[PDB]
Symmetry: D2
Amino acid sequence: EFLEGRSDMALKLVGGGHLICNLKTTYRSKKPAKNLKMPGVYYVDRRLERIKEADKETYVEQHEVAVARYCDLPSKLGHKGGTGGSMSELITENMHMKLYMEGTVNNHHFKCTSEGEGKPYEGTQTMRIKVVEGGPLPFAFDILATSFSKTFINHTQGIPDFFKQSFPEGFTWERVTTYEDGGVLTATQDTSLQDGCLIYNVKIRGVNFPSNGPVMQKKTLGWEASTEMLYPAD
Amino acid sequence: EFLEGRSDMALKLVGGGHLICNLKTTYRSKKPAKNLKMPGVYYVDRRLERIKEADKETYVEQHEVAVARYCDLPSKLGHKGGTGGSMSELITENMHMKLYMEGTVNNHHFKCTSEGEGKPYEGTQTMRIKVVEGGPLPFAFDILATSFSKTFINHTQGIPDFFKQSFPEGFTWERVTTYEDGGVLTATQDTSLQDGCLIYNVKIRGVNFPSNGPVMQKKTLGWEASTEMLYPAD
Amino acid sequence: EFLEGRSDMALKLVGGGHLICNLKTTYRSKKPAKNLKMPGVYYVDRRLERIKEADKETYVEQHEVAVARYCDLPSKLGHKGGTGGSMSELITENMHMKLYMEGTVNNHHFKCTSEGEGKPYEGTQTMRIKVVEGGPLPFAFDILATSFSKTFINHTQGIPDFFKQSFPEGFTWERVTTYEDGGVLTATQDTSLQDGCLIYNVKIRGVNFPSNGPVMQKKTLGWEASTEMLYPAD
Amino acid sequence: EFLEGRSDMALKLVGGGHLICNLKTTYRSKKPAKNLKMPGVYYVDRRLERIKEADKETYVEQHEVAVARYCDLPSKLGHKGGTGGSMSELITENMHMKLYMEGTVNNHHFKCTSEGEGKPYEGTQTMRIKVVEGGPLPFAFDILATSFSKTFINHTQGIPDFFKQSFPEGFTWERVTTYEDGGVLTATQDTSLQDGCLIYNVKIRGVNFPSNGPVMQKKTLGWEASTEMLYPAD
Ligand SMILES: [Mg+2]
């Protein structure tokens, strides 16, 4: 039993306009099935923003605000669900995170580290990111943004927090992002808890980004906000 | 200058679980560009529900609640939104609609008519739908649900209503719904205003739906709510 | 029981280079299952060439050579298939065709008629095509090329000709062509035999072709040759 | 300047039938552009067959025969490649190969080694493959078949051999395979020549393969033969 997510995000392009991409994510728990209180269908509203940038994109500081909900709207049918209610004690309201990243984008190899802090229950976080190997990146940094934190989703409407419940075992995610110009970037990730710090271990592998298109030429200017739909399966 | 939308909807399956599909929509105005007050990026939360169904799905009555917004969430940067403010006079707060649909799904041809009423500014509406030809359909009616009214979106927060402003000329849409099991359903549509009634004319052409998959075997059970991301281009 | 095909075609672009698209076709028979001699997996090599063009693309003349085969190459295992042998009699070795087409591409409506002749068993044909409505098209004619004749495939090596067997009842196809820049074009089609003439009925519904991309700007120069992979299911 | 490829392969299923997937590959040379003799558009017919299998798939011995061509078919126009002609001294007619592979498929990690030999100019090769970590795999070995050899393509008809020309520098490839049931498997690979042996280094990352589908349940039975379409870009 896991959660699958789906999003369509929009990339802002130099000169106006946008490039769309599609996110198919599968969220897997390391905690055993019997001990989880599974949600029903729900949505997470994010806004992901580039705060600071230095050195041809080899240093980037990212902020994110994530908030989960159920459909607020009244329903002529009986899907109040609703339901809800989850509590997660290992996660304090002030948490620190450390991350390591490694992968390839169009045959170009690179490594990244980051450290950050945020407020899980409030739905906010920040990430200070270093490109350590294979900088300057020849591709728009934006495409890695979604790969740097499911724990910091503010589940307010009682909705069961599938990510915060998982600890200490942890959770993984694995995602395939599909740009409409042809590019494809898959990423696998491990979230674990050691001494009260959240440890992220990612692996990027992207291919087929058009060479004379916005991603490789770096004509991008951050993302718009987005809605992820999340739903349980098998 | 027009609006493109992107949504991912979830289809409910007999036995739990879901089949996801992707909606790429282009909304075009018949009113001239200069006379339109274009919105910025925004989102529409819908909930579409089958009220009544009779005769192996040859009569179906649908209700929808659509509410548009901007990102409520605070932004570290200065994308205040909120701009806004649009007024559209031809659309009263009680509207009636009449519809004709014709198209093919996996070589099987069919025709539909419908009539309904709803409250545009409140975001609510109802549709009473008849299969007048080629019923009973060998496919789940659900896949047509999204093809029957952009005017009944409650634009509050002072978001410019691209759909209402358009009147009297009217507007069209054209969409490609892409199921993850392989099916593909495109639709072209014309909206227009004649004697204070909203007139819909649709055309469907769906192909490649697996014969032994949920859609053809009719093992589906309505949609979950969804979020559409609407954005201006060219 | 029917045949599915898959092709990837390449579009020649003004200035060198190519735009790839994907063809998913389902070919369905009108003749009863028991009286057909089903093929195995096999391949069709085509080369489609614009012989003539006049009037801003409102007259186009097409030649096609199609030849189906099985893998000639030796197999370490014993896949023979192999098999083969079909004869089809309603189809003479000189056939004439008449075709009608109607559909939409990015909200622009149009109709086409054509007449042509070829040698089915030899795998050749020509088509003389008139745009009778909604010319001049604001889009590259190329994208319609693949919608104007399955009967004229030279099945050598003894492969059972699934298309020639169908007569007199006839057969349909229905296809989704998916460009990598985003455009999508589906087409459903009906074949039949009336008075020794082959009668084609096509319908087009294409959407989402980027306005500032090759297809809408007409910066194309025909297709490259292609291989279609044909295989039976249900 | 490099080569892109496109294929559609068919996977054989327990109980008959097939699951199709799409291959987008980009082939990059490590040898400098001025010294390469680029091909034109062309095709490769392969047949990949599992010879032996032992220990729940932890040992697989693979055979491949690859033969490249242009379009044998006559053209009503001036397009005859034909050109062709390439010579590659460093590659003998009996070559040896050693490979290391590492990656993840649906959150499951694994490593593979293989060694093999074949006749590059004749277009044949064999691979003896050992699963060295994380066996037995919970997924159909098939989805890995295409990741173990571009040097052993028999370029007849005189097509300039882009893979053999690269030596000694070597070449990389990177590919995205997209199943129609939802799975996605990208792979990056490094080829090189050291002491007269071909050295392969692969990395796999497959995701979003359906849990209740053929690949994960191991209901597969090898590939059908296939055609890849190769074309130059940049
Ligand atoms: Mg969405």
